Amino acid sequence: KVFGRCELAAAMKRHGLDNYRGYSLGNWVCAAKFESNFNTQATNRNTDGSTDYGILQINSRWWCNDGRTPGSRNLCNIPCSALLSSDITASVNCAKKIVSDGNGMNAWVAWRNRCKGTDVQAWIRGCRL
């Protein structure tokens, strides 16, 4: 599913990400913009052979099982395919686990490099939340 910016903001809020671990909703929407272009079905292979899945490009190296990432974990206890659903529950719940792991949203390099320290509230500008 390709979410609209404001639609995704509202869903994310409904799923309790606004200000989760201190990160306002714009941070989350910004991250999703640059990780996946708001597409739930986005996937990307990394150089180590792990794969990133879904609107926040969560990696099979630590967080989900895809059966083809040797020596990986599955900390959100989910199949990676669950991160591709039009329903963002698995992605949100797994992201809450990631962002709570110690390094906050710096876990997402696209967030660090393109959202961190910017005016992220622009990403929710105009939205009925």
mmCIF file of C-alpha atoms in Angstrom:
data_model
loop_
_atom_site.group_PDB
_atom_site.id
_atom_site.type_symbol
_atom_site.label_atom_id
_atom_site.label_comp_id
_atom_site.label_asym_id
_atom_site.label_seq_id
_atom_site.Cartn_x
_atom_site.Cartn_y
_atom_site.Cartn_z
ATOM 1 C CA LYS A 1 0.000 0.000 0.000
ATOM 2 C CA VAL A 2 1.295 3.501 -0.759
ATOM 3 C CA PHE A 3 0.117 5.801 1.983
ATOM 4 C CA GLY A 4 -0.493 9.472 1.569
ATOM 5 C CA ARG A 5 1.653 11.638 3.882
ATOM 6 C CA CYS A 6 -1.265 12.732 6.035
ATOM 7 C CA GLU A 7 -2.905 9.305 5.965
ATOM 8 C CA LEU A 8 0.309 7.779 7.265
ATOM 9 C CA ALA A 9 0.646 10.445 9.937
ATOM 10 C CA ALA A 10 -2.873 9.613 11.184
ATOM 11 C CA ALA A 11 -2.299 5.832 11.179
ATOM 12 C CA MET A 12 1.028 6.252 12.932
ATOM 13 C CA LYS A 13 -0.632 8.349 15.599
ATOM 14 C CA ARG A 14 -3.410 5.878 15.955
ATOM 15 C CA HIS A 15 -0.697 3.257 16.502
ATOM 16 C CA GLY A 16 0.816 5.470 19.220
ATOM 17 C CA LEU A 17 4.027 6.607 17.606
ATOM 18 C CA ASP A 18 3.476 10.308 18.120
ATOM 19 C CA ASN A 19 6.073 11.314 20.681
ATOM 20 C CA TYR A 20 6.911 7.631 21.286
ATOM 21 C CA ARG A 21 10.354 7.503 23.009
ATOM 22 C CA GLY A 22 10.266 11.330 22.638
ATOM 23 C CA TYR A 23 10.021 11.345 18.819
ATOM 24 C CA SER A 24 7.333 13.579 17.483
ATOM 25 C CA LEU A 25 5.155 12.356 14.660
ATOM 26 C CA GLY A 26 7.063 14.319 11.999
ATOM 27 C CA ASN A 27 10.199 12.352 12.743
ATOM 28 C CA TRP A 28 8.319 9.123 11.957
ATOM 29 C CA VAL A 29 6.711 10.378 8.789
ATOM 30 C CA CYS A 30 10.066 11.811 7.636
ATOM 31 C CA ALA A 31 11.763 8.549 8.282
ATOM 32 C CA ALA A 32 9.143 6.631 6.354
ATOM 33 C CA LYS A 33 9.356 9.087 3.510
ATOM 34 C CA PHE A 34 13.043 8.484 2.953
ATOM 35 C CA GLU A 35 13.103 4.780 3.865
ATOM 36 C CA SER A 36 10.212 3.664 1.691
ATOM 37 C CA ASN A 37 8.429 6.584 0.044
ATOM 38 C CA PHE A 38 5.445 5.593 2.143
ATOM 39 C CA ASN A 39 5.196 2.224 0.370
ATOM 40 C CA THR A 40 4.438 -0.725 2.711
ATOM 41 C CA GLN A 41 5.808 -3.185 0.077
ATOM 42 C CA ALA A 42 9.279 -1.606 -0.248
ATOM 43 C CA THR A 43 12.173 -4.044 0.106
ATOM 44 C CA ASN A 44 15.923 -3.449 -0.329
ATOM 45 C CA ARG A 45 18.842 -5.943 -0.105
ATOM 46 C CA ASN A 46 21.787 -4.830 2.008
ATOM 47 C CA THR A 47 25.417 -5.694 1.238
ATOM 48 C CA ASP A 48 25.614 -8.232 4.083
ATOM 49 C CA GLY A 49 22.783 -10.179 2.493
ATOM 50 C CA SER A 50 20.110 -9.133 5.002
ATOM 51 C CA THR A 51 16.986 -7.413 3.646
ATOM 52 C CA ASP A 52 15.030 -4.293 4.707
ATOM 53 C CA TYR A 53 11.241 -4.460 4.695
ATOM 54 C CA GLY A 54 8.281 -2.162 4.765
ATOM 55 C CA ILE A 55 7.539 1.480 5.416
ATOM 56 C CA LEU A 56 10.445 1.815 7.887
ATOM 57 C CA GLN A 57 12.812 -0.649 6.133
ATOM 58 C CA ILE A 58 13.335 -2.932 9.121
ATOM 59 C CA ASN A 59 16.225 -5.293 8.683
ATOM 60 C CA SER A 60 16.173 -9.078 8.830
ATOM 61 C CA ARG A 61 19.712 -9.027 10.349
ATOM 62 C CA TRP A 62 18.125 -8.419 13.796
ATOM 63 C CA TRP A 63 14.335 -7.861 13.759
ATOM 64 C CA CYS A 64 12.364 -10.253 11.561
ATOM 65 C CA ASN A 65 12.686 -13.697 10.045
ATOM 66 C CA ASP A 66 12.860 -14.152 6.306
ATOM 67 C CA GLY A 67 14.605 -17.562 6.299
ATOM 68 C CA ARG A 68 17.568 -16.306 4.259
ATOM 69 C CA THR A 69 19.663 -14.173 6.571
ATOM 70 C CA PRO A 70 22.258 -16.505 8.157
ATOM 71 C CA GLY A 71 23.073 -15.880 11.782
ATOM 72 C CA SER A 72 20.288 -13.371 12.111
ATOM 73 C CA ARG A 73 17.992 -13.070 15.143
ATOM 74 C CA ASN A 74 14.220 -12.217 14.875
ATOM 75 C CA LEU A 75 13.799 -9.842 17.802
ATOM 76 C CA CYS A 76 10.267 -8.637 16.857
ATOM 77 C CA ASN A 77 9.260 -12.253 16.501
ATOM 78 C CA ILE A 78 7.583 -11.839 13.149
ATOM 79 C CA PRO A 79 8.032 -12.968 9.560
ATOM 80 C CA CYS A 80 9.574 -10.141 7.539
ATOM 81 C CA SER A 81 6.588 -10.414 5.193
ATOM 82 C CA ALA A 82 4.392 -9.037 7.988
ATOM 83 C CA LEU A 83 6.227 -5.739 7.539
ATOM 84 C CA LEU A 84 4.864 -5.455 4.036
ATOM 85 C CA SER A 85 1.170 -5.486 4.955
ATOM 86 C CA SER A 86 -1.276 -2.672 4.213
ATOM 87 C CA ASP A 87 -1.869 -2.881 8.009
ATOM 88 C CA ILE A 88 1.030 -1.138 9.740
ATOM 89 C CA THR A 89 0.706 -2.869 13.072
ATOM 90 C CA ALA A 90 3.769 -5.181 12.717
ATOM 91 C CA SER A 91 5.940 -2.320 11.398
ATOM 92 C CA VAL A 92 4.876 0.010 14.160
ATOM 93 C CA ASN A 93 5.201 -2.496 16.935
ATOM 94 C CA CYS A 94 8.653 -3.555 15.726
ATOM 95 C CA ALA A 95 9.786 0.031 15.317
ATOM 96 C CA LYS A 96 8.814 0.752 18.934
ATOM 97 C CA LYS A 97 11.162 -2.095 19.909
ATOM 98 C CA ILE A 98 13.953 -0.763 17.676
ATOM 99 C CA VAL A 99 13.741 2.815 18.785
ATOM 100 C CA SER A 100 13.786 1.648 22.411
ATOM 101 C CA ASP A 101 16.989 -0.337 21.905
ATOM 102 C CA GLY A 102 19.499 2.339 22.958
ATOM 103 C CA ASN A 103 20.175 4.624 19.983
ATOM 104 C CA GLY A 104 16.758 6.007 19.433
ATOM 105 C CA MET A 105 15.914 6.851 15.837
ATOM 106 C CA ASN A 106 19.603 6.845 14.852
ATOM 107 C CA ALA A 107 18.900 3.163 14.188
ATOM 108 C CA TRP A 108 17.503 4.433 10.882
ATOM 109 C CA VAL A 109 20.443 5.887 8.982
ATOM 110 C CA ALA A 110 18.083 7.657 6.582
ATOM 111 C CA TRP A 111 16.523 9.386 9.608
ATOM 112 C CA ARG A 112 19.902 10.476 10.907
ATOM 113 C CA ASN A 113 21.079 11.688 7.554
ATOM 114 C CA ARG A 114 17.912 13.358 6.206
ATOM 115 C CA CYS A 115 15.495 14.065 9.089
ATOM 116 C CA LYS A 116 17.478 14.517 12.291
ATOM 117 C CA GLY A 117 17.750 18.204 13.269
ATOM 118 C CA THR A 118 15.525 19.350 10.408
ATOM 119 C CA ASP A 119 12.099 20.961 10.672
ATOM 120 C CA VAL A 120 10.336 17.629 10.715
ATOM 121 C CA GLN A 121 7.042 19.125 11.798
ATOM 122 C CA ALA A 122 6.692 20.180 8.157
ATOM 123 C CA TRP A 123 5.953 16.522 7.443
ATOM 124 C CA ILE A 124 2.643 16.690 9.350
ATOM 125 C CA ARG A 125 1.902 20.251 8.310
ATOM 126 C CA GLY A 126 -1.692 20.604 7.217
ATOM 127 C CA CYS A 127 -2.827 17.218 8.432
ATOM 128 C CA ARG A 128 -6.033 16.588 10.324
ATOM 129 C CA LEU A 129 -4.541 14.289 12.957
#
